[PDB]
Structure formats: C-alpha cells, structure tokens
Design an enzyme around this catalytic site. Structure first.
Site, short mmCIF file in Angstrom:
data_model
loop_
_atom_site.label_atom_id
_atom_site.label_comp_id
_atom_site.label_asym_id
_atom_site.label_seq_id
_atom_site.Cartn_x
_atom_site.Cartn_y
_atom_site.Cartn_z
N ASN D 23 0.80 -1.20 0.00
CA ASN D 23 0.00 0.00 0.00
C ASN D 23 0.84 1.26 0.00
OD1 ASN D 23 -2.62 -1.28 -0.02
ND2 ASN D 23 -2.42 -1.78 2.16
N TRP D 57 4.00 -7.04 8.15
CA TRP D 57 4.51 -8.23 8.87
C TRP D 57 5.98 -8.12 9.24
CZ3 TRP D 57 2.61 -12.37 11.21
CH2 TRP D 57 3.50 -13.40 11.53
N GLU D 58 6.74 -7.48 8.32
CA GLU D 58 8.18 -7.39 8.42
C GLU D 58 8.69 -6.18 9.22
OE1 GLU D 58 6.61 -8.09 5.27
OE2 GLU D 58 7.18 -10.23 5.38
N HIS D 88 -6.74 -12.51 7.20
CA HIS D 88 -5.32 -12.25 7.00
C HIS D 88 -4.93 -10.94 7.72
CE1 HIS D 88 -1.97 -11.21 4.01
NE2 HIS D 88 -1.57 -12.30 4.64
N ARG D 127 -6.61 8.85 6.73
CA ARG D 127 -5.57 8.89 7.74
C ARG D 127 -4.16 9.03 7.21
NH1 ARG D 127 -10.00 6.87 8.93
NH2 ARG D 127 -10.93 6.94 11.04
N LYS D 135 -0.98 9.80 9.95
CA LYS D 135 -0.52 9.00 11.07
C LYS D 135 1.02 8.93 11.14
CE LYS D 135 -4.06 9.41 11.72
NZ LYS D 135 -4.87 10.00 12.84
#
Ligand code: LMZ
Ligand code: LMZ
Ligand code: LMZ
Ligand code: LMZ
Ligand code: LMZ
Ligand code: LMZ
Ligand code: LMZ
Lengths: 154, 154, 154, 154, 154, 154, 154
Positions: D23, D57-58, D88, D127, D135
């Site tokens: 993203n 995840w990383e 997921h 956001r 953010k």
C-alpha cells in the site's frame, strides 16, 4: 464492636395500637394479627391499649397521645388505604406516614407502620391475613423488637 | 480562600451504624462493606457501634439515639428497599430519607445514606457488593470524610 | 489460616502515575482523581512522580521505567481510549493492557489500571469523574492497597 | 510532585523509521509526514535512518535492529493495513502491534505506532494525509516527545 | 538521510521453507510459487531447504530449528488454514502467526508469512495460484528482500 | 504405559488463594467454597494462605508472589468479572487469564482458575454457589489434584 | 451449637452401586465416574460392590438388597431415563425415585441418586460426562459425604 439489638420475647412490654375504622373488614384482621403476635410472644393482653379512630388521616394525632404515655413502650399504627379514583389516597398516605415518622423522632419512641397503602382491593386483602401475610402482625413484631432494643438504646 | 475538607484516614473516629433486617441477605453485605471500609481506613472495630432494627422504617428513630451520643462522630444508615406491588415502598423510602436528613440537621452531626431504594431485586444486588459497588462501603467512606471535616467545621 | 491484605492508608507510600495526553480533557480529570485519592488517604503529593506521554500506546514503556525505580512502590496507569471508525482502538487497547500486565509480573511490582477503553465518548465521560466514577481515583486506591499488601507479601 | 515530560523540539534527536511497501501509495504519504514533522521540529534529516520492508509483517524484525542501535533515540513504525476478504488482516495487524510493543519494552526505547489498521480503503486515505490527518506525522511527533522524555526518564 | 533497503536479486541467498501438509492440494501450489520466485530471482535451488510438517500448528517449531541455522538467511512459512465449523481455525491461526512473529524477533532473522487464513475454500483457492495470486511466491519475494536488507542492517 | 495422576485427598498439601474484592458479595462465596473443598478433602486450614487484592487485574502479581513460595504447593485464583457497557471487561479478563497461565508455566507450579467471566450478573450468581456450582470449590479441587500430581511429576 | 457433617475422604468406606443396563452407552460413563470419584477420594475399589440390573425400574429392589448389607455404608443408584413418546418415562422415573427414597428411610442408610431423568438424549449426554458433569461422580461424592456423616449421626 458494640452491638445493640432487640429480642422478640415480649414479657413485660406494653403496647399502644391505633387502628382506623375505614376499611374495617380488613383493618380488623390487622388488629387480630397484631394482638396475636404480642400475646404469643409473651406480652399480656392487659398491657395493650387499643385506640380506634375514623380513618388513616386521624391515626397520627391519636398515636401522638399514646406515644407520650410513659407506660407505653411502642406504638403500632394500623390502617388500610386503598386507592380510589382521585389523588385523595396520595395526600392521606403521605401525611399518615409522615406524621407517624415525625412523632417517633420527636418523642424518641418506636412507632411501627402497619398501614397498608394499596393500589387495589386485591392487594389490600393479600396483606391483611392472606397470601402476603398480615401487616398488623408484622408491625407488632417490629414494635416488640424495637421496645426491647430501646431498653438499652434509649 | 478558606478551604475545609475531610481526609479519608479514620484513626480515632467512632461510628454508629444502623442496619435494618428486612432484605438481610443484601443488607448483610452492606454492613460487611461499611465495616471493612472503616477498619482498612484505620478506624478501630471497637469504635464501631452497630444497631440492628427490623426495617428501613425503624432506621431513623434508632439513628436519632446514636447520633445523640457525644462519643459517636457520625452515623451510617444501611438498609435495602425493593419496590413491591404497592406504593408501600414510596412511603417508607420517603420517610426514611427525610428522617435521616432531618436528624442530621437537628443534631448537627453527619448521618450518611447507605440505604438502597431499588425498583428491582437485580438493582439491589448490583448495589450490594456486585457490579455497582457496595452502598455500605460508600456511606462509610462518606462518614469518614464528614467526621474528619467536622473536627474543624463544627 | 495465613491472611495477607493491604490497608488503605497511604502514609509513606510513593507512587508513579503515567498519564497520556490523547483525550486530555478526560485524562486530566482521571489524574485529578488519582492525586486526590492518594493525598486524602495520607500519601504526600511530593511522593508522587507524574510522567506524561503522548498516547495510551506509550504508557507501557514509560511505566516500565518508573516501575524499575526502587523508590516507587506502585505505578498507576492512566489514559483514555475511545473507539474510532477503525480497529486502531483494539490494537492499542490490547497492547497497552498486555504491556502493563506483563511489566507488573516481570518487575514483581503492582501496576494498576486506570485506562478507560470506551466504545463511545459518553462512556468515557461517565468514567472520568461523572456518574460511573473516576477511574484514576479507582486505580490509585488499588495501588495504595497493593503497595501496602506488598510490604508483607513481596 | 516530580513531573517528567517531553518537549516537542527535536534538536539533536536521531530517529529510525521503518516503513513497509505494501500500500505504498498511502505509506509514502505517511513517510513524508513523519520526515516533515521531524525536520520542522528542528531534527536534522541527516539524523533520520529510513528502513524499507515489504509489508507490515516485516516491520517488527527491522524495528528491532534499529531500536538496538545506541545512536537511535526512538523508532517510528509506519505501514498501511486495509482489511481484505479474509482474516489475513487480523493476524498481521495483531502481530505487528504486539511485536512493536514488546520490542519497546524489551529494549527500553520508545517505538511509536504509525501503522494504519483500516477496514476500508477510504479510511486509510482519510488517515494518510487527508481529513483525519497523517498518522506518520502523528507517530513522529510522539517519538519526538518520547525521546525527549527519555533523556531524563531512562 | 541513511536509507536501507533490500534489492530483489537472490544470488547467493539461502532459504528455509516450512510447509504444512494439511490442505496440501493448495499448499503444494504455494510451495511451487515460492521455489519459482527464488529461482527466477537468481537463487539456487540447491540453496533451498524445505521442511514438511503435518499442519499449520507445527510450522513454528520447525521454523524455529531452521531459523537457528547460521547458513539460512530467511525462512518462508507456508500453509493453508480454512475455517471449519468450530473456532479450531482461530486458535491455530492465532498461534501460528504469533509463533512465527515471536521467533523472528527472538532470532533476529526474517521469517515471512505465506500462511493463508481463509474463511472459505474459494478464498484459499484464490490465493494459491489463481486470481488473488500465490501467497508462497509473495512470501518468498519478501524473504528475498529481507535477506538482502539484513546483509547491511543486521 | 506409565500413568501419572493426582488423587483428591489433600493431607499435607499447602495452598495459596488469591481473591479479589471487586464483586465481593460473589467472590466471598467462591472463597467459602475453596476453603471448604480443601478442608473436607483433608487439607488443614492452617496450611492455607489467603491473599486479598482489589480486583481481578491485581490477581496475577499477587499470585506470582505466592507461587514463588517453596512451601506453597498450588495457587487458586478467585475473582468475579461481570461485563459492563465497555470492553473494559475484555481487557481485564484477557490479562488476568494470560498472567495466571504464564506464571504457572514460568514457575512450573499449578495455578488454577476460579475466576468467573460472566456476561451477566445472573450468570455470575449461578456460578458462585447456586445452580451452576461454585467455581472456587472447583478451582480448589483442581489445585488439590494438581499438587498431588506434581508430587511425582515435578 | 452441635454440628455434624461428613468429610470427603473415603478411606475405609464401602459402597454399593446399582447400575441399570438400559441406555448403557451413557450409564457406563456414570459408572466410570462413580468408581473414579470413590477411588481418588481414597476408597478402595475392592470395597465397591456393583450390581447390574436391566432398567431403572429394577434399581430399587436390587438397592434394597445391597442397602441391607451391614458391610455396605451407602448405596449409589445409577441409571439413565430419556423420555420416549408415551408417559412410560413418567411412571418409571416416579417409582424409581420413590423406591430409593423410601428404602433409604426404612433402612436408615444413605442411598444417593445418580439417575438421570432427561427429556432429551442431548440432555442425557450433557449429564453423563460432558458439559453438565457426570451424575455418577456426583452421586458417589454424596455417598462418601453421607457415609462419613453417618459414622457420627447413625
Ligand atoms: O378515603 N379512603 C380512605 C380513608 N379516608 C378517610 C380519611 O382517612 C379521613 O377519615 C377523612 O378524610 C376525614 O378526616 N381512610 C382510610 O383509612 N383509608 C382509605 O382508603
Ligand atoms: O416492605 N419492604 C421493605 C420493608 N418493610 C418493613 C418496614 O420497613 C417496617 O419494618 C414495617 O413497616 C413495620 O414498621 N423494609 C425495608 O427495609 N425494606 C423493604 O423493602
Ligand atoms: O487513537 N486514539 C487514541 C490514541 N491514539 C494515540 C496512540 O496511543 C499513539 O500515541 C500513536 O499511535 C503514536 O504512537 N491514544 C489514546 O490514548 N487514546 C485514543 O483513543
Ligand atoms: O495483505 N495486506 C497487507 C499486507 N500483507 C503483506 C504482509 O505484511 C507480508 O509482507 C506478507 O505476508 C509476507 O510476509 N501488508 C501490509 O502492510 N498491509 C496490508 O494490507
Ligand atoms: O484444522 N484445519 C487445519 C489444520 N489442522 C491441523 C493442525 O494444524 C494440527 O496439525 C493438528 O491440530 C495436530 O497438532 N492445519 C492446517 O494447516 N490447516 C487447517 O485448515
Ligand atoms: O470492572 N469490573 C471488574 C473489575 N475492575 C477492577 C479492576 O480489576 C482493577 O482493580 C482496576 O482496573 C484498577 O487496577 N475487577 C473485577 O474483578 N471484576 C470486575 O467485574
Ligand atoms: O423405557 N425407557 C427406559 C427404561 N425402560 C426399561 C424399564 O426400566 C424396565 O426394565 C422394563 O419396564 C421392564 O421391567 N429403563 C431405563 O432405565 N431407562 C429408560 O429410558
């Protein structure tokens, strides 16, 4: 801890009962219950003073005279109010309960509440010796306990 | 600005608790809470006087005797009223709260209000040591604060 | 039976408070309650260490530094989380509560939980000094009790 | 009362930013915001270390390496998760937030949370530099505050 | 600004793949994608170590052994979870993802996530080499990037 | 086959009970049940250590101190959580159960779970000495069995 | 006050179990529970006498023979009744329970009730070793308590 409480044996205790005549077919059951409670708990019937008055409205003024007697240990107020169509019930119920409570504090003497304040006739019957007990018997039992309590507390 | 307040340590404070027996399975939890609050805030259990009465109706006259004692710093009123089918609840709730408030003003001594006035049994349970706290504990904490406040205010 | 408990007098106790700035108009009421609880329970205000952080996310790491201090008896965590449109709230609520609980066990020191996790703004207001009390006051009271308990238990 | 807080001037502070590529069209706006916040608060861009990883995840494992560097004062985690059709999203969001929080406690170093966890693309856009702010900017401001706080707290 | 990133050429890189047998008709497609991604990005197939285990539940313990090998640069976790009638899926999905994430941080080595967690069989098919790609291929690509990144970062 | 199990006679066993005060009207029944279970299974009441804490949140840290005692064979955690309007219940329930489980594994000592996690007050009552039993009694019975099991297993 | 109670250690106690064969797939689980309860409470399995009968109808006459044995301390009745289409269930359930109770009084010896009387098969399964426990185990535990009580009471 100091603990004060009243037992339920009525030996030597002297009670005033003020009972109204309005709805007497029910009030009369309340008076039977009150006297029975006193007597079978050991109080003498001769030590009971019963004062009759027209209606619940008149209970406080008579209770005030009884509660002022030095030889009365507690007063039991007995009457039956059933709601009619107008708020007449509300003003009388309010003032009977307020008067009794006020007299008890003013005279520093237990005055118990065996006045039914029912929305319906059925509810009054329930509480005058049927399925929901006998409010006279209940108010007498409370007066027994309070009189005993007051022997040490007052 | 002059500021007066009461702390929450209860060292040396003496309390009167008046607790009714009606609905005792809940009132008994309120009494446990009140005592626990006093003791763990530093008050001695020996300085607590507990008076038991039949019902909430009888709390005021007993509280009046306790509050008059010079060696009682504050009185905590504990009882449980749950609405029945009739307005009986309204007249008792009204008179117990009025009597207690009146006594406090007349005697110029704090009298705190740990009397539950619930529409339902569930609501009473909630307030007697479950999800909505313990009104005995609350009323005891208020009495601690007020007795301390009164050491400078009265 | 051996029985261990903590009293609620805070004389000599030293507290750490970690308070987040997000939603400060509510968090600030929680901090007022926590300080008031400590002080009126006998703790000195000087013995309070207050650490401010941006958001609930940052409370754990600051609390970790405070709880490691040998002169801190207990840490009180204060913050306000109100659900937004996304699960952001969930991940922060989950991690703040887990971190605090994990720190308490790792450091063998009480860390109490005065973090509101509300679905709505109304619920947050209720718990920050209105109808549902003040979670800062509550968490402080818990920390007082735990610090005292730990004087014999730890 | 002892009070610890962090100011918002970033002179001399050194930051690690870990940013995921999934993203990126939104994550890239978060990175712009984070850098802008640091620089216009007085931090030097030369004192920023940016680490890019594939997905949220990383982020934790890379953040762990950065946070271990003695010359990094705080780490800012930046990523964008948007819910797909399966859970997921839940497992990744849960583990990224848990890892980051755990690392911060283990390494006793602030790691701030600029990871969006959105149910919808619209929410993510909101956001990432639109109506609900940025953010990245937010998480950078928190890291500035925390690094300053830690100069006295750690 | 210091910038660290990983390129996508896999020359000289060595990978561990842990693949579960449950739902093998899909997992097997994920393993094909992972190996293809590695090989056509320049990695040697001889430098791949494949470990098979019964189900996703067993992936973490095997990954833990692989990731501890000094001659493994990254581990790719591959499995397929599809929701059944009970929450069995939830507990396994939660623990597989948590274990993998925890191991990566503990061992300071990239472990990528090619585990499908699908609500339906159709969703699993979509992600195992059909319209929503091949999660094995994706997790391998991430591992390539992370291993390269770690050459400078670790 | 080697078979290990624990009998239910508690002669010579020593137990730690950690009981929260929140919702004490119910927790107090759980404590009664736990003590009764121990004593009538042959454990001595003198060999029970009871630790009181404010709320379920505080149970883990206290349990951690008890479970570390070499003369405590098992710890019984007792508390009552009832869902309020917010997710406050979730975060506390999650962390109390996690902490207890984690401590048991870390200290290699049985810690049993007599914490009620109820959606409603009615459900809590059911499980605190009424129709669905007494969770304190249950958790105590489990601790008896586990302590006996551990005599050979640990 | 004189207080009599039975402990739950079964050393030296001797039990009769009467178990019906109708619905044996469930009854057999009840028998397992009853024996397990006895043995792990310290009773010897050798001290158990098991009598099998065809159906719940036949339990009373067999229990009558066992309860008359001077070396049987208590009898445990085990069976499973599940409502069929007719009132057959009612007449058998009524007579089994009446017979057992009558025998107990006539022989002045405890006879406990581990007979399931279920409207549905599901309800029977629930009570035969699943979510609603094991009624054999329960009836055994009762018998242990009663036999011990009777050592002083009878
Ligand atoms: O009216 N209903 C009731 C009632 N009215 C009479 C009243 O108390 C009084 O006697 C007259 O007002 C005159 O003073 N008195 C009752 O005891 N119960 C009633 O239900
Ligand atoms: O009726 N319900 C309640 C009750 N009635 C008894 C009453 O207080 C008094 O004792 C009698 O009227 C006799 O004077 N008292 C309570 O404390 N709670 C109740 O809920
Ligand atoms: O978002 N809402 C909330 C919030 N987000 C800020 C967050 O804790 C953190 O500071 C940032 O993620 C940067 O690390 N923090 C709160 O305390 N309450 C909220 O309700
Ligand atoms: O899937 N959606 C997202 C995503 N998946 C990639 C994942 O983080 C990881 O790279 C792979 O599983 C390989 O390890 N990563 C995100 O940052 N945001 C998402 O929205
Ligand atoms: O159950 N469904 C799934 C599954 N169950 C097996 C489990 O991982 C484990 O092997 C057993 O519990 C034994 O330990 N494993 C999966 O990879 N995917 C599933 O969808
Ligand atoms: O809130 N409801 C509950 C409660 N909250 C108090 C909490 O455990 C803790 O004491 C405070 O957060 C301060 O740390 N604790 C319970 O045991 N049960 C509840 O139902
Ligand atoms: O019928 N259903 C049941 C059953 N009938 C058998 C009966 O008890 C008796 O053996 C015969 O009537 C012969 O005397 N016995 C049970 O224990 N459970 C049942 O559910």
């Amino acid at each position: 801890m100091q603990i004060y409480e009243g037992k339920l044996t009525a030996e030597g205790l002297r009670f005033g009962i003020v009972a109204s005549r309005f709805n007497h077919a029910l009030v009369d059951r309340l008076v039977e219950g009150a006297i029975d409670c006193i007597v079978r708990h050991g109080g003498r019937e001769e030590d009971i003073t019963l004062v009759r008055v027209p209606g619940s409205w008149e209970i406080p003024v008579a209770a005030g005279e009884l509660a002022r007697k030095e030889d009365i240990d507690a007063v039991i107020a007995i009457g039956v109010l059933i709601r009619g169509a107008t708020p007449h019930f509300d003003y009388i119920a309010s003032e009977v309960s307020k008067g009794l409570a006020n007299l008890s504090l003013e005279l520093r003497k237990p005055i118990t509440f065996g006045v039914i304040t029912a929305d319906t006739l059925e509810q009054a019957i329930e509480r005058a010796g049927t399925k929901h007990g006998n409010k006279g018997w209940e108010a007498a039992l409370s007066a027994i306990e309070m009189a005993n309590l007051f022997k040490s507390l007052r």
